[PDB]
From Swiss-Prot:
Range within the parent protein: 37 to 288 of 559
Highest taxon above the source species: Eukaryota
Family as reported in the entry's similarity comment: Belongs to the receptors of complement activation (RCA) family.
Organism: Rattus norvegicus (Rat)
Lineage per the UniProt record: Eukaryota, Metazoa, Chordata, Craniata, Vertebrata
Record-given protein name: Complement component receptor 1-like protein
Subcellular location as annotated: Membrane
Self-association state and partner proteins as the record states: Interacts with C3b.
Sushi domain ranges (all copies): 1-59, 60-121, 122-189, 191-247
Disulfide bonds: 2-44, 31-57, 62-103, 89-119, 124-170, 150-187, 193-235, 221-247
The protein's role, per its UniProt record: Acts as a cofactor for complement factor I, a serine protease which protects autologous cells against complement-mediated injury by cleaving C3b and C4b deposited on host tissue. Also acts as a decay-accelerating factor, preventing the formation of C4b2a and C3bBb, the amplification convertases of the complement cascade. Seems to act as a costimulatory factor for T-cells. May play a crucial role in early embryonic development by maintaining fetomaternal tolerance.
Amino acid sequence: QCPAPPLFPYAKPINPDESTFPVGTSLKYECRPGYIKRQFSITCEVNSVWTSPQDVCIRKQCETPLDPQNGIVHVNTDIRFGSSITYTCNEGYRLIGSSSAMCIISDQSVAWDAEAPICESIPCEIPPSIPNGDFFSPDFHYGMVVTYQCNTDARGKKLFNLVGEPSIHCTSIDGQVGVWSGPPPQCIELNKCTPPHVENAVIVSKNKSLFSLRDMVEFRCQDGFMMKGDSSVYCRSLNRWEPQPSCA
């Protein structure tokens, strides 16, 4: 009075074709590849329904995954047959290798179909060379800082004004390519001024790549705003402008 047995995703019959079994019939089943090896029986009970033993087939375990150095392993389900793991690298590190692995049948057991990846520090190009100066460094990777310094004269006395941020650091925008945080500073002669900047204004006087002491600069505010302060300023020592205007 029993119908054909259920068709288990984890088990198969040891000796496979029929559609009618009397009550009390026992059939010999086997756990499929990737499950811990076991032979068992399914029985046709008095009410014409089949019963199999509890937790008969357990999925085989793959080796314990570890977090890469400077990275993390993500176990989304478990570390058994059919499951997958993904890897990510931490901030300032980039992945080399496979970003995922799956627990698959390997010979007479189970194994990860890929090796764990490396999370290496994002590298940087040598920082820029600047005329009349250089950077101090103890090979550049994410986070490293470099400070620039102007050359002194042959007697160790100040010869240039260091203009801008003296320090820059290796960073990244995409998490793959390393970029320096900003531009390097400049080493300007003591009787010179660098071109001045006023937001939402243009220079109407002669533009210069570099200005000399007492040189004048005239600014014009763009259409929409206008002068606050004097429009004319003059080059002072130590890269200063006297007086120091605005466009609001």
